[PDB]
Design a binder for this molecule. Structure first.
Ligand SMILES: CN1CN([C@@H]2O[C@H](COP(=O)(O)OP(=O)(O)OP(=O)(O)O)[C@@H](O)[C@H]2O)c2nc(N)[nH]c(=O)c21
Length: 119
């Protein structure tokens, strides 16, 4: 169901180390791929010990980017990525939507992760 067909991968891998026989990721990661035919760019970040946070969504889906909320939520579930953190003061101007709790709102609700549209 959700996320069916999503394909992509990290173009910028997070930094990593092995702690207690487990890999731990930290720093900035950039994932790029396709969802429903559209290009999607997702950035995550965390310090060592904090779960990765969704800090940027960029897509070429201009006509209905809200249709990406379900596959982004599923991608994030698979990855352990959270969407509670507010990046509104740390983001470049030009966001067209904001994602928080994996739901999308328009520019009058600037809280959470910015959603940029590029084509
Ligand atoms: C680079 N990776 C890989 N990875 C986790 O490992 C899964 C498989 O990643 P992969 O890109 O297929 O393999 P890869 O890490 O390149 O393996 P290898 O380099 O040993 O060949 C990913 O779906 C994800 O769960 C990651 N998870 C987080 N949070 N951040 C990251 O940068 C990365």
């Amino acid at each position: 169901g959700p996320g069916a067909g999503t394909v992509g991968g990290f173009i910028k891998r997070q930094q990593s180390k092995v702690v207690q026989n487990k890999v731990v990721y930290y720093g900035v990661g950039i994932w790029r791929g396709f969802m429903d035919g559209y290009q999607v760019h997702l950035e995550i970040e965390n310090d060592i010990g904090q779960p990765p946070r969704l800090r940027n969504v960029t897509t070429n889906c201009q006509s209905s980017p809200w249709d990406l909320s379900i596959p982004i939520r599923q991608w994030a579930e698979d990855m352990g990525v959270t969407n509670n953190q507010d990046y509104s003061s740390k983001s470049s101007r030009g966001a067209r939507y904001w994602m928080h709790s994996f739901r999308m709102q328009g520019p009058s609700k600037p809280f959470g992760c910015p959603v940029y549209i590029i084509k």
